[model samples]
Target chain A: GANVLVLKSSINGETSLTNQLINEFLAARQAAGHGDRLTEHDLSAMALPTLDRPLFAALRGAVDPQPAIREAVALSDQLIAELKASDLLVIGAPMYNLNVPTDLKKWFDLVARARETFRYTESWPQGLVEGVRAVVVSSRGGIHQGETTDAVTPYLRAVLGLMGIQEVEFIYAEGLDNRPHGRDAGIASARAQIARLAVQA
Target chain B: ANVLVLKSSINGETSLTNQLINEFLAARQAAGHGDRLTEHDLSAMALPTLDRPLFAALRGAVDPQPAIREAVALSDQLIAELKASDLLVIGAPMYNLNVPTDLKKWFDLVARARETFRYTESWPQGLVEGVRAVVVSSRGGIHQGETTDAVTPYLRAVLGLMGIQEVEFIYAEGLDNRPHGRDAGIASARAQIARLAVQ
Candidate 1:
């Protein structure tokens, strides 16, 4: 059985285009006999614990950390467990201020443990979590597919790569805030991509 | 003259970026401009997220409860800190190839409407004047002049919005991996900081 983890980071919630596309992606996965084995993490509404000094100490294997640090580590470990149990990750991200939302970043900071998700090596750090494929469904107001101003794509790649997610697919619904029927065209383009992905997935 | 130093390194006190910031401060002290220095530990304080209630309070909403009041007061202090500073030294360690969430929260609070910038007939104009910034950027890999270095361009644009036109950068790259990479990166940045402190 295939297990899918859905992460939603759109502040608009159900109204966001990212969520709309995620729904479509979910529908496609269901149609492909993937069934309804899915878990969702809506970071938009999450009150994430802060990644502070004590938490960092506890996470990095400090000897007998305080109670607050222990609580923070437990939270992080649970998040990592959720990630490890999944086979497919459907990340719906809404580009805010030319970068991923702060909530999404905070989640990454917590779950990216030193020894848990990734371990140090002689040369470069290697990712511990493997065999999962990530489909990044990103929506943006303007077109930034290959521009330096588009920090969304590259940062996602770097972070995901750091965590050992190799089979990653990026789908963008860009230019939503454009003049004319740009939003329609962008959605259509992304839909076509998703349709093709459904069969392969 | 007052100088504000903001540090964001999740690696705690042992972080290379934090050490780089200290070296930069020492350089400033040697040049006699470090006497009136004020520092903010962005990694220690539990910064509140910029959610709906916080935004409402920041935008002059009524019925300011205790939670809303505290959040706004913190933002006010952050804004005042920037206003009092002649120079801003930011320790930005690239986390997952971008500035960490702590720095993002700091930016969210300080970039206030009508306080840091004003909306004119056409667009918003910056209110923060007579200030320059030097961002001490640290990274595990070399991302200078590449698309992956989101920290530099964003730091430039965000500070520019507050009328800080002249922004300088010193990169401490290749710190997380390799033996000599950590020390070499810091030394290179410290060399640049020594050169920067005179002027």
Candidate 2:
């Protein structure tokens, strides 16, 4: 029984391959009787806050923060609290324009708050959250594995590690839009990986 | 000269890179070079991501939905703005080890089929060409030479895909953590912007 936090960030919504794979992973976990305790945040459905002027001002501790600033800070705290409460973090992050979707990045922007998830030291920033594992399910249309185009995983790893989630694992499903045999091959391979990952997760 | 300023700073234009961009634009204006200027503040404007309906429309699905049509129209307008400009200035702030989400969304919207780029056997060739871009990249950490700064390469790749290969990058690194290094970074970035303006 693990406290899992599942985040989905596919703009395709219900029909996204990344979303489907995550659901399959969750289904397997449920079948194994370990899915009773879980929380989900659908980034596409949620109105994620971007780093804007007012929010930035609020983050820097504005003198008498406005209502909107107060609300934004509260949202950041809630997001950070959610991450803190979870022991296992699962993310369905689809690649958009060679990177993670803006929806997903917005979530990261909120959670990467200094003094909350991370704190700046004399040399470097240190992550506060500890003892958490992350499993990232990345889906792409083209074949970008093991190439320079595969920036999604590295970027995600670096960002997550900034929050002390260094024990990160990745399951990549690439070339899903490729015609002929590529789509099936990618999905099947990803499903097999998911099957193995879910049990350990 | 027609100038387009695209800013995607999470903290609005108050970020270092965007402030540099403002100075660059002001220099160009003071030089009496840019007669027309177009400014797109992505942070202030909420541009939704391309959803299922928009994809369906792109795939030639019949009876395109109204929301899809509206979004496509907005994308078209954004693309037109890019096309009309001769000089492109972008403020890219590193967020979570990469470029801001708003900047990426702007790229996605502009890189439409047969609009900004096209597919070929050799590669997806860029349809828009001859426009020079100046990317002001600002990072909180000093990771420009390191592998963690994935934002630069991604920005270059996507801009190259759109045929904007002649790019000049100005890096403002380690301003957030390095109190002693902040002034040097700002001064160097300002000088670079001044040099780029003359060019």
Candidate 3:
């Protein structure tokens, strides 16, 4: 049985185009009778604590710490454990100011822990999580796919690669705000790609 | 002239990048153009992320409740700080191959609609202009000119979006892998900073 984790970070929640597309993708998968277990994590539903002094200290192997720090570390550990348990991950990453949202970044900061998701040696650091597939459903307002301004793709790839998820796919719904009839066109194109991925996976 | 110094290093004041920025500010002051300096240390700030309440307030989707009003007030205060300054100096340390979340939080607060920028028919126009930002960036690896250095480009785009077009980035790279390289890189960065401050 395959377990898929869907992490969404749209500030607008269900009203966001990216989130709607993700919902459609998952619905198609279920309608196709894939029978994959699905788990959803909504980053915007609650406040994500930034990496502060106490959480940083706890991550560095501090045993005795403040009560807030202990709770935060526990939350981080749970997030990492979910990632480790999943075989496939889907992220609805709406481009916020040319990059991923601060909410998504905060989630990444929590999960990319040392000696858990990745490890350091003398030569280089190696990712610990292995053999997972990630499909990033990215939505952008303008046409910045191959341009220098597209930071979201490269940054996500780098960070996920650091976690040992080398095989990654991007379903880009670009120019959703600029092109003629862009919103419908972008979503239709993305749904087509998601359908193919559902069959292929 | 007023200078706003935004420091975003998690290591706080003792960070090498912050120390280098201090050197630049001190040099600038000693050069006789004595300006009023205001510092905002982002790492120590309890910044509010632009969530539903804040977004609703900005978009006029609803009347601002107490929480939304508080969030909007914070955003306005941050924008006012930027508007009051002529020169912006940013201490940016590369975290996870990009700018710190603290720095991004600050950008989010300042890039509010109808405050710092507004959407015009075909495009969005930045309301805040006429200021310059000098980004002092430090990285631990040898990724200065490679495509892997996402920090500088992202910083440039965000600052430009807010209408701060005249930007300069001083990179201190390769500080963790090679000792000799670290020393040389720091020296070059310090020299560049001194020259920039004097100018």
Candidate 4:
């Protein structure tokens, strides 16, 4: 019943396209009669710091585990706890400069742990974080739409899938400024898809 | 030594990756090559987003046009710069749970088949050698566990795939959520940096 985690990586201090995603998600949940039960997590608002060497050193069990490294690793453990408490994860990942922003990347660095997020098998790598469904609200400035050219979408899909979030749906609000009818066209396409997708959900 | 400081940190001073650059400078000075610190921050420089012509050249085919030749030349120049490096300080940050695209764009340009990699009768060979890489990332929350994080292994695979055997990471996480965590993470990171200089 209470299982959704709405996560966003917008650095705009609440006034961002990622905010629109959450509002849309909430509205959909409201329509579906589940708005009151939805759990939300605005990562930027949480102001998660960037991953630094201390966290890396702790995981590798460096010679001298600094106090800060110990704390970073503990915080990492806390974040994993949050993920484990939820079932459905909704992420708003906007493509910044043809790739993801460092903030979002650092956030993933926290969770992408060994023997926790995934595990490698003898023949092939098998994902450990199974049975989790995700909806990726991915936005891009310039519309580079195609498998051959679109590095952002494919890479996100591959990595997310590798984490065992295999069933992922993408909502792209791309080409927001490259054209005269940019904002309207992009959001309209996404809104249409969202309306239908929310029903099936 | 040619250094490709692939920095994703927008903040110049507070970045741990920038510290790696400082370490490179220190090492260079110690090695009697203090005059060779040419720092190329990708985010601060003019970078072209990858497109069709560039991808085509990656396929071992010759292109006769000027723009294509220029693109190929850029790749060659980057690889040559990389080849000259005894130690590489790669200031990388995770974007969308994996390696940053701009850095990947640079890799795509420089990584040419038969030039960077080749499948010998025995196994796939990596041409780039004697290069040690250090990857620094700043992460949010605490995910290095198998269930929630997705950055570490992917980066390890990418470096290994590109023929970089000796790779090290300096990462700090959970700087955003709590104050105590930030202090601990930063201190731990500094300790790793100090050790890097010794061994």
Please provide, for model 4 over B1-199, each residue's C-alpha lDDT reduced to its tens digit, 9 standing for 90 to 100: 5555566554457665566557645755665663454456665544444443454665555463776777677778778877777667777654435555346556656656677666554334578888778777666555555333445554554455458788887776666546787787677667766666554
lDDT of 1 by residue, A1-201 (tens): 578888887767677788889999889877887675888888879777777766777788875457767877888999899888888888986776556777788889888877788865547669888888899999876677886556677778777777888788988898877645888999998998898887665
How high is the DockQ of candidate 1?
Answer: 0.41
Per residue, candidate 2 scores C-alpha lDDT tens digits across B109-176 of 88766788786743568887668888998776787767677787777777877888888888877787
TM-score of chain A of 4: 0.86
- For model 4 the local lDDT of residue A197 reads 63
Q: Is the docking of candidate 4 incorrect, acceptable, medium or high quality?
A: incorrect
Question: What is candidate 1's local distance difference test score?
Answer: 0.80
- Tell me how candidate 4 scores on lDDT: 0.63
Which has the greatest DockQ? Answer: 3
Q: Provide the lDDT at A68 for model 2.
A: 68
lDDT of 4 at B65: 71
Q: Chain B in candidate 4 has what TM-score?
A: 0.82
Choose the strongest candidate by TM-score. Answer: 3
DockQ of each: 0.41, 0.56, 0.62, 0.06
* Models sorted by TM-score, best on top: 3, 2, 1, 4
Cα RMSDs, all models: 3.3, 2.7, 2.0, 13.8
Candidate 2 colliding pairs: A51-B10
Candidate 3 per-residue lDDT over residues A55-89, each given as its tens digit: 77788798845787888888899999889999889
Question: Model 1, range B68-176, lDDT digits (tens) per residue?
Answer: 7888999999999899888898988887667978888898788777788775644356799888998989887788887667788778766866778889998988776
Name the fnat for model 1. 0.36
Fnat of candidate 2 is 0.59
